[PDB]
């Protein structure tokens, strides 16, 4: 009887946007329904004078069975009452023509080794998430330290997404 309601989930307390900046390599992911980033998913976060966070994100996308596309996207993050929860507005500059928006929750991070991202797109009537995606980010693409592995596995299970993540490759397909 685990509480899988989206409102009951806990996020990074006192989230620091400036310390979260820099390169983040997604090593594992949980997919939503429909088309989504496949692999080689690298994120680059930044903060400006005003303190508003922004980021760029590259990644390979399998559109049809015989077409690979290195998506190159830019996004801005709007602040909310919770410092770890944001409203991400994003768009493409290479292939993706349209724009969209999702919630961007930093569930937990130590800023210099790992980070667990979460985003619920659709909510069930009971409060649980009907359609979600999540990323296990890392500063080092070679791997995570032992302590980072333990926290990630714990947070993944607390989000009710145990054994639903798949690993993803970084082989320089998009440079
Ligand atoms: O859904 C998409 C792109 C998309 C939209 C519509 C159809 C297909 C796709 C996809 F490219 F296949 F994923 N997202 C959501 C997640 N989004 C991110 N996820 C994790 N971190 C980041 S940092 C950042 C984005 C971003 C978008 C812009 C800056 C990547 C773009
Ligand atoms: Cl699409
Ligand atoms: Cl694009």
Swiss-Prot record:
Pfam families, from UniProt?
A: Lipocalin
Kindly state the tissue distribution recorded for this protein. Detected in blood plasma and in urine (at protein level).
Q: Where in the cell is it found?
A: Secreted
Tell me where in this chain the PTM Omega-N-methylarginine is found: 121
Per the UniProt entry, what are the Gene Ontology biological process annotations, in alphabetical order?
A: cardiac muscle tissue development; detection of light stimulus involved in visual perception; embryonic organ morphogenesis; embryonic retina morphogenesis in camera-type eye; embryonic skeletal system development; eye development; female genitalia morphogenesis; gluconeogenesis
Q: Quote the InterPro entries the UniProt record gives.
A: Calycin, Lipocalin_ApoD, Lipocalin_CS, Lipocln_cytosolic_FA-bd_dom, Retinol-bd/Purpurin
MF (Gene Ontology): molecular carrier activity; protein-containing complex binding; retinal binding; retinol binding; retinol transmembrane transporter activity
Task: Report residues binding substrate.
Answer: 98
Keywords (alphabetical) are: Disease variant, Disulfide bond, Methylation, Microphthalmia, Retinol-binding, Secreted, Sensory transduction, Signal, Transport, Vision, Vitamin A
Do the record's keywords include Disulfide bond? yes
What is the name listed in the Swiss-Prot or TrEMBL entry for this protein? Retinol-binding protein 4
Q: From which organism does this entry originate?
A: Homo sapiens
Q: What is the lineage of its organism?
A: Eukaryota, Metazoa, Chordata, Craniata, Vertebrata
